[PDB]
Structures are given as structure tokens and as C-alpha cells.
Structure 1
Amino acid sequence: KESMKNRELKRQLTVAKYAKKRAELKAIIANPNSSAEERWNAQVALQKQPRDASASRLRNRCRLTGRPHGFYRKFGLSRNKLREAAMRGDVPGLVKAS
């Protein structure tokens, strides 16, 4: 859809917006020398943030097409747009071989 790319655009904003406090709240919990009173109130600040901030909510879709399945991260393309753009000599250094 087009309305479905648009709702997973703003997830990428809200993850990259906060992005620093959640490093600190997970720095407090991960220490064995940390006190649980400093841990328990640190648990409060995680769950009162909106949940669309973790990377697990983020879903790497194809950038030109939007199809979820068949994505590679050494490119930005889908499974079936990568073929049509490679036969036209665009992708540099890419050939067939055996």
C-alpha cells in the first residue's frame, strides 16, 4: 500500500528521536554493581515511553518498492527489483559467474 509505507516511516523517526535515554536506562540495569533501587525506578522510565522506540518494532522494508519479504542489506532493494536494475548495468561490480 501507500498508507502502509507512511505509517512505517514515522516509526523510523521515533526510534531515532529518543535513542539515547534508552541506552542509559539499559546501562543502569546491565550492571551487576548497580543497586536495585536504582534499577526499579529505571524500569519506570522504560514502560512510560511510547513503545515504538525499540529496534524490534522497526521493519526494514524495500526502499523503492515497499515489499517486506525478500530484502537484502548489502543493497536497499527487493528480491525482484534488484534483478531488473542489475541487468541494466546500474549496480557496479555485479556480474554473473560460476
Structure 2
Amino acid sequence: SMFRAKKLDLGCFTNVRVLRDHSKRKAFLEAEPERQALRYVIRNTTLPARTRAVAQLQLTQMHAYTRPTQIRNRCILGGKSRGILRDFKMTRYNFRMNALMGNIPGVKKASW
């Protein structure tokens, strides 16, 4: 909740979990270098054992929003998390409806 901006800054389809996933994307952007440093000290077997253990503990205390594995694309029109296409940021269905109306540039019904 501390990562949710007090003023909404989303122009797409807003949802309880779209705000949740948008907050994780902003938190990871702010703490990716700090996180890469810890992940480097841990995997660096040339450092002292204590140094690697300190970084290994600090990486466990970082908030969950800072983990990139918790970022899952969503549909900017419907807000689902299943069936999303990276090239369009939409579900397979909203891609079909917009593709047939001509709202996705370059896409056309395939036949060969």
C-alpha cells in the first residue's frame, strides 16, 4: 500500500490488480540497481563468506514489490492476466475484436 501513489496516474483500464501491478513496476524501477548489487555480491565467490552472507540477508528483507518476478503483464483494456500478448498489451480476445475493426495497425486475418 505504501507503493500506491495517492494520486492515480493510469490512463488505461484501471483495476484493483492493475493498480497493484503498476505499483510493482514503479517500485522495481527505483530499486533495480540496488537489487543487482546484492545479486552480484552473492554470486561473487571471490568475496569473503561474511560479505556474501550479509548481502544474502538484505536481499531477503527487500519488499515484495521490488522483486521483478512479481511483474505480470495485464490487458490495458480489460485488466486480465491470462492470454496477454506482449506485442499488443491485450488479451487474445481484445486483440481479435480490435484487429477485425482495424484498430491494430498492420494486423489482418491470415489465410494461406
Question: Fold conserved (TM > 0.5)?
Answer: yes
For residues 1-98 of structure 1, the aligned pairs below 5 Å read 2-95=15-108, 96-98=110-112
Amino acid at match of 2:80: R
Q: CA deviation at 1:27?
A: 0.9
The secondary structure found in structure 2 opposite 1:14 is helix
For residues 31-54 of structure 1, the C-alpha deviation after alignment (integer angstroms, 9 at most, x for no partner) is 232221110111122122212211
C-alpha RMSD of the superposition: 1.7
TM norm structure 1: 0.86
Output the amino acid matched with 2:54: N
| Structure-1 separation of matches of 2:82 and 2:46 | 43
How does the TM-score come out when normalised to structure 2? 0.77
Unaligned stretches of 5+ residues in structure 2: 1-13
Give the count of matched residue pairs: 98
Write the distance in 1 (CA, Å) between the matches of 2:107 and 2:22.
Answer: 30
